[PDB]
């Protein structure tokens, strides 16, 4: 109960902070919207009331998702500074900011989707379409690598 709303609240704070970041916004708004897609089945589970109780396997998957949100939370404040992003863009090869966090959220989502449908009997919907998360990260990184170099 309390842990369910804490993860939902933490996910909503992550999305709000991504909208406020000024540099490399395409990758930031991509991360915050992916977090919204993962917490929405948890919000619907919260809408049911006090009758739904997560099991041990579901709580373990939510804690791994919570630790990933706290990892992404530290990367948001870290990449809120211009010099920290330039230190990363000039030292990395793919120039993808949250490639480590996006991969951790992709594995925990398929573990949450399986447990939300089988155990809680909750209907879930896919996150996004268009392309894979790998191709979406490269397209957003190249667009951000172009606008960031234009800043004087």
């Amino acid at each position: 109960s309390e842990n369910l709303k804490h993860i939902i609240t933490l996910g909503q704070v992550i999305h709000k902070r991504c909208e406020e970041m000024k540099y490399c916004k395409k990758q930031c708004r991509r991360l915050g919207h992916r977090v919204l897609g993962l917490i929405k089945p948890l919000e619907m589970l919260q809408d049911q009331g006090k009758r739904s109780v997560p099991s041990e396997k579901l709580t373990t998957a939510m804690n791994r998702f919570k630790a990933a949100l706290e990892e992404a939370n530290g990367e948001i404040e870290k990449f809120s500074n211009r010099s920290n992003i330039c230190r990363f863009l000039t030292a990395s090869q793919d120039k993808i900011l949250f490639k480590d966090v996006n991969r951790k959220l992709s594995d925990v989502w398929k573990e949450l989707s399986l447990l939300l449908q089988v155990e809680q009997r909750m209907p879930v919907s896919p996150i996004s379409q268009g392309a894979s998360w790998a191709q979406e990260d490269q397209q957003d990184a190249d667009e951000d690598r172009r606008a960031f170099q234009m800043l004087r």
Partner: protein
Amino acid sequence: VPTKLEVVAATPTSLLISWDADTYYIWYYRITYGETGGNSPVQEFTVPGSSSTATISGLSPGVDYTITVYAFSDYYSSPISINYRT
């Protein structure tokens, strides 16, 4: 007590995990690892509290594993778990 569990080095068959904790007060750790979901079996081994890294070997290439760390203290802990695919 233990926090920030990551895979800092990885081969298709072996991993190297690392975590941050106050190792001065920690007796030892219990490292558990196994295939995720489906009531898959798990294997255990101990690591002294003075260190903050552990080596896991003998894994299958291309499998999503679940790695959990149980910190134990004798002077005075909730476990942390992550997921990694070799």
